[PDB]
Amino acid sequence: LPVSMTKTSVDCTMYICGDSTECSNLLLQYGSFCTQLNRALTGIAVEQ
Amino acid sequence: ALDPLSETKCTLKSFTVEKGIYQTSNFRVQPTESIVRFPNITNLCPFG
Ligand SMILES: *[C@@H]1O[C@H](CO)[C@@H](O[C@@H]2O[C@H](CO)[C@@H](O)[C@H](O)[C@H]2NC(C)=O)[C@H](O)[C@H]1NC(C)=O
């Protein structure tokens, strides 16, 4: 039986915008997604 | 932007932080040489 998958983690703002301040500025309009998106992974991460 | 303990508060959006660990900040590493460069010559053109 498996036990745990690799504890992947990504930071949207990097993944979405590889250090392009213009990019992040537009994203911030989208609000709490790429907080919660980050959160669930950590929830995945810890739960591992 | 004060210091890491503060930047943590910038994430949870709480003035009080429970004991633990918190993925806080968008760390980055930097280049230090803005190198402009090229290769290794041999056969010149004889305008002689
Ligand atoms: C590339 O340019 C260099 C000159 O900067 C050529 O001169 C040297 O050739 C000798 C013998 O091959 C090497 O031991 C040297 O290392 C080369 N340059 C230096 C100072 O290290 C070189 O021949 C050219 N390309 C080749 C084929 O090596």
Chain A environment of B28 (Cβ under 8 Å): 19
Q: What is the CA radius of gyration of chain A?
A: 13
Minimal Cα–Cα distance from B48 to chain A, Å? 51
Q: How far apart are CA A8 and CA A37, in angstroms?
A: 12
**Is any Cβ of chain A less than 8 angstroms from the Cβ of B23?**
yes
Write the single-letter amino acid at A15.
Y
Q: Are A13 and B28 a contacting pair at CB < 8 A?
A: no
Using CA coordinates, name the residue in chain A closest to B10: A35
Determination technique for this entry: cryo-EM
Structure-block tokens of residue A47: 């739960």
Which has the closest alpha carbon to B19: B33, B5, B29? B5
**Burial class for A27, CB neighbours closer than 10 Å (0-12, 13-18, 19+):** middle
Tell me, what DSSP letter sits at residue A29?
G
